[PDB]
């Protein structure tokens, strides 16, 4: 009995306009990573292709709890914040064991 892990990619946009520009491109579904590096103020982490890294389930901050991204491949999650708009993408889903042996 251990926590499953989720790989989220997230990028911060200046306005909803920026978010729409980002989600419009990823709506075609070609590259999210590209969108991440160019406009996002996330780029401290976005330079990794928008990948924030593998987080463990139930260690997730409430911000991404509202992202609703449990199904792998689902992108264009726009999180409305006062600080700006966050774009969340699902890179992968692992039920803990999924790698070699957990």
UniProtKB/Swiss-Prot annotation:
Record localization: Cell inner membrane
Annotated ranges, domain PpiC: 3-92
Gene induction: By heat shock via the sigma factor RpoH. Member of the two-component system CpxA/CpxR regulon.
Domain of life, source organism: Bacteria
Consequence of gene disruption: Deletion of the gene retards the release of a translocating outer membrane protein into the periplasm. Null mutation leads to the induction of the periplasmic stress response. Null mutants are hypersensitive to hydrophobic antibiotics such as novobiocin and to detergents such as SDS, and exhibit altered outer membrane proteins profile. In contrast, another study shows that inactivation of the gene has no discernible effect on the levels of outer membrane proteins. Lack of the gene confers increased temperature-sensitivity in a degP mutant. (Microbial infection) Deletion of the gene leads to partial reduction in the plating efficiency of bacteriophage T4.
Domain commentary: Consists of an N-terminal helix that anchors PpiD in the inner membrane, followed by three domains that face the periplasm. The first or the third domain are probably chaperone domains. The second domain is a parvulin-like domain, which is devoid of catalytic activity. It shows a parvulin fold and resembles most closely the inactive first parvulin domain of SurA, which is part of the chaperone unit of this protein and presumably involved in substrate recognition.
Function, as annotated: Chaperone that functions as a gatekeeper on the periplasmic side of the SecYEG translocon. Facilitates the translocation of precursor proteins across SecYEG by interacting with the translocating substrate. Also plays a role in the release of newly synthesized secreted proteins at the periplasmic exit site of the Sec translocon. May be involved in the early periplasmic folding of many newly translocated proteins. Acts as a transient subunit of the Sec translocon that binds to the lateral gate of SecY and is detached by nascent membrane proteins but not by SecA. Does not have peptidyl-prolyl isomerase (PPIase) activity. PPIase activity could not be generated by substitutions at the peptide binding site of the isolated parvulin-like domain.
Protein family according to the UniProt entry: Belongs to the PpiD chaperone family.
Note: Overexpression restores viability of surA skp double deletion mutant but it does not completely compensate for the growth defect caused by the simultaneous lack of the SurA and Skp chaperones. Suppression of surA skp lethality does not require the parvulin domain but the membrane-localization of PpiD. In the absence of both SurA and Skp, overproduction of PpiD can, at least in part, counteract the defects in the biogenesis of OmpA and possibly of other OMPs.
Record text on subunit structure and interactions: Interacts with the SecYEG translocon. Binds to the lateral gate of SecY. Forms a complex with YfgM. Also interacts with YidC. Interacts with peptide substrates and misfolded proteins. Has been isolated as a homodimer and homotrimer from inner membrane preparations. (Microbial infection) Interacts with the central spike complex of bacteriophage T4.
Protein's recorded name: Periplasmic chaperone PpiD
Organism: Escherichia coli (strain K12)
Gene: ppiD
